[PDB]
């Protein structure tokens, strides 16, 4: 079976901890992508979250250093010249991800659970592209994500659980949008508090493993909110 040999080569490349040679071989199940099941769906998510996750974490350290100008030296343009060298493969590591979504995964997904998953991840890689955008690109890519987030809501408001962790994670994710892109904590506080209270209410009949990870993000909503009420 051509599928399982393509997932076994990508189920051990994260166990061996080398994601770049998994990201370039986890996308290959989409080329024959009849139906992505959820048990290998998030295998693609863990890959692409960690591949760019090293770069943007490397990106923030370089921006922290370049604005530490020490007055203005005659060398830090090379720090700015090195700064572009991260941004060059920042744009080349995301374009396939959003690129492979709308071509294959979104126009085959029959369940709305998949539809909110793929559209959220569709919206996400503009956000990591929002802070690196820095110009008129900043005021063009974020509305693409905004409607991608806004398309993500209706399939989650109706047609999803009040405590589904993808829906809870979405408003968790989308709360982080508005502050460091659109600069409005009042939208951010008012978006977070609702689903925060909507899921603490009726914690009765859910099993504890769904209660487990959802508390790992509901408490992440608290430490997110307390930064916002402080400013």
């Amino acid at each position: 079976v051509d599928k399982e040999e393509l997932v076994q080569r990508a189920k051990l490349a994260e166990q061996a901890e080398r994601y770049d040679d998994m990201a370039a071989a986890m996308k290959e199940v989409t080329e024959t992508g009849v139906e992505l099941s959820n048990e290998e769906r998030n295998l693609l998510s863990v890959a692409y979250k960690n591949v760019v996750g090293a770069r943007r974490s490397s990106w923030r350290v370089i921006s922290s250093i370049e604005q530490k100008t020490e007055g203005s030296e005659r060398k830090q343009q090379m720090a700015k010249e090195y700064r572009v060298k991260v941004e060059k493969e920042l744009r080349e590591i995301c374009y396939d991800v959003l690129g492979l979504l709308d071509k294959h995964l979104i126009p085959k997904a029959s369940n709305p659970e998949s539809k909110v998953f793929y559209l959220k991840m569709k919206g996400d890689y503009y956000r990591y592209l929002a802070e690196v955008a820095t110009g008129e690109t900043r005021n063009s890519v974020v509305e693409d994500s905004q409607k991608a987030y806004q398309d993500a809501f209706e399939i989650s408001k109706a047609k999803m659980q009040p405590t589904h962790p993808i829906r809870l994670g979405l408003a968790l994710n989308f709360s982080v949008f508005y502050y460091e892109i659109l600069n409005s904590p009042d939208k951010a506080c008012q978006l977070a508090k609702q689903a925060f209270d909507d899921a603490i209410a009726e914690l009765d009949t859910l099993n504890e493993d769904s209660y487990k990870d959802s508390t790992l993000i509901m408490q992440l909503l608290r430490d997110n909110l307390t930064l916002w009420t402080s400013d």
């Binding site: 998030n42 998510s45 863990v46 994670g169 994710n173 460091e180 993000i217 608290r222 430490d223 997110n224």
Partner: protein
């Protein structure tokens, strides 16, 4: 009476013998340290230095102060302190360059004040405070030592100068520049050295950065032309901690606040920020 009889302590490796600190390693009842006299004959200044420092470490029992374990006198004058593993604060700032969170930047700044009042409630002048005499115990709780110039309330026994030769130029009071007949060390003259630590702690820089030597420094400490420029503060300094250090390192020596006040202000910052400045996202499984 913890006069330690000779033979119990087992000296091991040397650590440092520079500016009068001939520190060593011991092994009695767990690892301890030992400071001994350099020369074999104590002069009338050396014997008087030991005969107050054995008393000033008698009087301090608090966790955030350096512990005291004993003293020996038969082979040479030794002082049995504790042995704190970890690293200094000055090494943590401008040598290893550890990027400190602003949460654990004040629990360092609280526990150097929540323990220094125990020197002031028991009324000790920590006469020579620096930013490198603070020390961390496995990087989580702090310990302060170096009582090498520590004095008690000395209105009953007069003291001479015995000063003005130290590496404490970057934390030096203007009263220290004056050197009056009344002893310029005081409780009010102690918070200024606490203040220039807090500037050097919070902004993560070295105090009095633009300085070629001590030629321009000491002219302008007590005159009114050198000042700690706290406006080069860090990116996230909350408004209480931004404001106390303004009145802390005052030039007016009586305007400076009392030490149970400067604990009482920083204990109000309990609910300040639970998490980091980075607002979190969804987790990776």
């Amino acid at each position: 009476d913890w006069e330690i009889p000779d033979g119990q302590i087992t000296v091991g490796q040397r650590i440092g013998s520079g500016s009068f600190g001939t520190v060593y390693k011991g092994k009695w009842h767990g690892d301890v340290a030992v400071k001994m006299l350099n020369v074999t004959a104590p002069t009338p200044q050396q014997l008087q230095a030991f005969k107050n420092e054995v008393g000033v470490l008698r009087k301090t029992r608090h966790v955030n102060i350096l512990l005291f374990m004993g003293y020996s006198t038969k082979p040479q004058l030794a002082i049995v302190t504790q042995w704190c593993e970890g690293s200094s604060l000055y090494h943590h700032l401008h040598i290893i360059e550890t990027k400190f969170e602003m949460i654990k930047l004040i629990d360092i700044a609280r526990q150097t004040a929540q323990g220094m009042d125990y020197l002031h409630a028991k009324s000790i002048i920590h006469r020579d405070l620096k930013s490198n005499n603070i020390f961390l115990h496995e990087d989580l709780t702090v310990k302060i030592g170096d009582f090498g110039l520590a004095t008690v309330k000395s209105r009953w026994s007069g003291s001479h100068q015995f000063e003005q030769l130290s590496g404490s130029i970057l934390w030096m009071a203007p009263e220290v520049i004056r050197m009056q007949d009344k002893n310029p060390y005081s409780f009010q003259s102690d918070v200024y050295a606490f203040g220039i630590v807090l500037y050097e702690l919070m902004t993560g820089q070295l105090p009095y950065s633009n300085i070629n030597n001590r030629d321009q420094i000491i002219f302008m400490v007590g005159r009114g032309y050198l000042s700690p420029d706290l406006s080069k503060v860090r990116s996230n300094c909350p408004k209480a901690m931004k404001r106390l250090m303004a009145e802390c390192l005052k030039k007016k020596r009586d305007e400076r606040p009392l030490f149970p006040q400067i604990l009482a202000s920083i204990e109000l910052l309990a609910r300040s920020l639970p998490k980091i400045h980075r607002s979190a996202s969804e987790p990776s499984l």
